[PDB]
């Protein structure tokens, strides 16, 4: 919806934004559902006047009679009149006294010490570390070869335990379309399967499109077979410079005649005559007796199609077997004494990484206290003891006198250290909104936590508002 609130307010004498409160009422809305990233206004450009000249910016003033603001999501308390109108309101992200007004539903707060919220510091980045990572797969041994087989006799390349590196597959030398049966062209390295069956051969370019589920022809009936639900891809490229003789390579054959169809991934490589008609040849090879395999007859000077086009298949499968071929993403660097979202081979936690004095045995990868909590983790490719330290969470109190006697407050950050993080209270890192206190003036330290906004006095007065560990705050006259 695009609801538009409205209230004509001519009570103003002309002053820019007079101090007060009012209520707004809406009128209409309608749906569009469009992404928007530009805001502009349109004038009655045929009549322009009262436009002065200036160069004001960065919190200055210059006569415009226009006002622009950008709204934000806030929690916000209202007061309803007995008639029903709105008489007063506060927001819970401005000042500690406002948050105190919000934690207990009233417009007045009395003397004492309260509780508002926590101030847990957020992480800065994320890091991932993996095994040394290597023993990768020699997939280059497939494409880079001079012994490419035939369609009626192909090679079966099964990939054993290694690391699946697909960087040289789509990013390097992508001669033709990927022709992915079922896989993400971008997420090739992300998800991995058990084993890959690779076959290399040559067919006609016009017959290259025949390599797809549910497609038949001269090569998909007896020579080569594919499952309908095949997963993986096929890579094709020109090979005119590979196999092109003066007369052309005739050693490549294709099956054309057979008694029945072909089972999925079956090789019927054989040399026998075909029983055509009523001539059961027993070596005659004469009338109605021909060899099912027919010479391809390569032509170096011919155009597309008949030119050597080599296709290598990748038969993926997802079977309930241990992972064999998988390529993980490269492990990032390491940080110390910085709150980050560390990940160590399936150990995604947040906190601070520091060097540990422990002496893990050669078969130790975790570490625990008696809490069922992860304590120390060994680096997968540095072989040392990396200790784990949590974040710097803690609560926030607020010390105030009566709201109708004073308006200034002091905030106690219990269980933390002003030498630690909260002194550098900054936007987008600390949940509390007010990053406005200098955190260098009127800063004091106490066993229960460091206190902001009060000055230690070496007098001795009876306790008014207890704090803890003997320190007792109070309002006073200087």
């Amino acid at each position, epitope marked *: 919806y695009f609801k538009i609130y409205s209230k004509h307010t001519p009570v103003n004498l002309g002053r820019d934004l007079p101090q007060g409160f009012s209520a707004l009422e809406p009128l209409v809305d309608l749906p569009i559902g469009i992404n928007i990233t530009r805001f502009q206004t349109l004038l009655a450009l045929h009549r322009s006047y009262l436009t002065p000249g200036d160069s004001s910016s960065s919190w200055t003033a210059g006569a415009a009679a226009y006002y622009v603001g950008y709204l934000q999501p806030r929690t916000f308390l209202l007061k309803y009149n007995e008639n029903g109108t709105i008489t007063d309101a506060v927001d819970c992200a401005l000042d500690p006294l406002s948050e105190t007004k919000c934690t207990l539903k009233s417009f007045t707060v009395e003397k004492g010490i309260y509780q508002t919220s926590n101030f847990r510091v957020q992480p800065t980045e994320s890091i991932v570390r993996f095994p040394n990572i290597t023993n*990768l*797969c*020699p997939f*280059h041994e497939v494409f*880079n*070869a*001079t*012994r490419f087989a035939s369609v009626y006799a192909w090679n079966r390349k099964r990939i054993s335990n290694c690391v699946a590196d697909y960087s040289v597959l789509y990013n390097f030398a992508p001669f033709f379309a990927f022709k992915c049966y079922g896989v993400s062209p971008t997420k090739l390295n992300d998800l991995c399967f058990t084993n890959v069956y690779a076959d290399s051969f040559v067919i006609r370019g016009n017959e290259v499109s025949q390599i797809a589920p549910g497609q038949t022809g001269n090569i998909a009936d007896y020579n080569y077979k594919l499952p309908d639900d095949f997963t993986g891809c096929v890579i094709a490229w020109n090979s005119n*410079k*590979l196999d092109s003789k003066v007369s052309g390579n005739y050693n490549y054959l294709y099956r054309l005649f057979r008694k029945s169809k072909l089972k999925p991934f079956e090789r019927d490589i054989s040399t026998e005559i075909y029983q055509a008609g009523n001539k059961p040849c027993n070596g005659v090879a004469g009338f109605n007796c021909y060899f099912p395999l027919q010479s391809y007859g390569f032509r170096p000077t011919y155009g597309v199609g008949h030119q050597p086009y080599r296709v290598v298949v990748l038969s993926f499968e997802l079977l309930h077997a241990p992972a064999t071929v998988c390529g993980p993403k490269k492990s990032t660097n390491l940080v110390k004494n910085k709150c980050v979202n560390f990940n160590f081979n399936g150990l995604t936690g947040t906190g601070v990484l520091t060097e540990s004095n422990k002496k893990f045995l050669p078969f130790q990868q975790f570490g625990r206290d008696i809490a069922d909590t992860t304590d120390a983790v060994r680096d997968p490719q540095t072989l040392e003891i990396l200790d784990i330290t949590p974040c710097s969470f803690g609560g926030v109190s607020v010390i105030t006198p009566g709201t109708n006697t004073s308006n200034q407050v002091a905030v106690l950050y219990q269980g933390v250290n002003c030498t630690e993080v909260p002194v550098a209270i900054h936007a987008d890192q600390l949940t509390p909104t007010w990053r406005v206190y200098s955190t260098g003036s009127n800063v004091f330290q106490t066993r229960a936590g460091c206190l902001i906004g009060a000055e230690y006095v070496n007098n001795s007065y009876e306790c008014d508002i207890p704090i803890g560990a003997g320190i007792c705050a109070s309002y006073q006259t200087q």
Partner: antibody
Amino acid sequence: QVQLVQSGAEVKKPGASVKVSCKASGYPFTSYGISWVRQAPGQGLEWMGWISTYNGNTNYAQKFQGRVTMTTDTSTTTGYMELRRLRSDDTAVYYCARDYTRGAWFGESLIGGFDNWGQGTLV
Amino acid sequence: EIVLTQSPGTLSLSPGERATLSCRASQTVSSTSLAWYQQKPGQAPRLLIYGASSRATGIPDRFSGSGSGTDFTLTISRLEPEDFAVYYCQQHDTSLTFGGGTKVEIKR
């Protein structure tokens, strides 16, 4: 980035054995075969040695068949020739290279040659 | 064994002229089986071309490959006078062999 290093010059007498070292770093020592050639003034290079990395399969040349033996260390990625049957004037330089003609896993004929070489040893 | 017959005995020509390197096959070499090796005086050998003319280490405009089928050769245009390197050609169809050899002098 590739760092191939070798030992220094040596002097050896006939009847003993000469040891030659070639250390490799910067590239994965699992998928590239190790080749060893001999170069001397007045002639070109040879095909004295060829070893893989996954297995201990050898491709020694027919000229020096049964007379060359070299070990391969995957931890330090080092080729160690322990050449025997020393002869009086076998003084020539030896070069270790990362082959790109036969793979270290299957071993078919690749498209390439000795793109990366070592620094050489003198005996 | 099959060896390659090379007859560039000496290219006694000044730098900046067209140069021809011969790698005539003995009986038969595949189209996709060729390697070119560079050897500057007192340096480690290095591969130049892993095929006919496809570049491996830079090769801005000098080293080129030509031919097809059984016969092949190398063409040099606008040679830079510093190199004066030794060029070898290698076949891959039968084990691993090197060429006869090539010498290029100063040509003052």
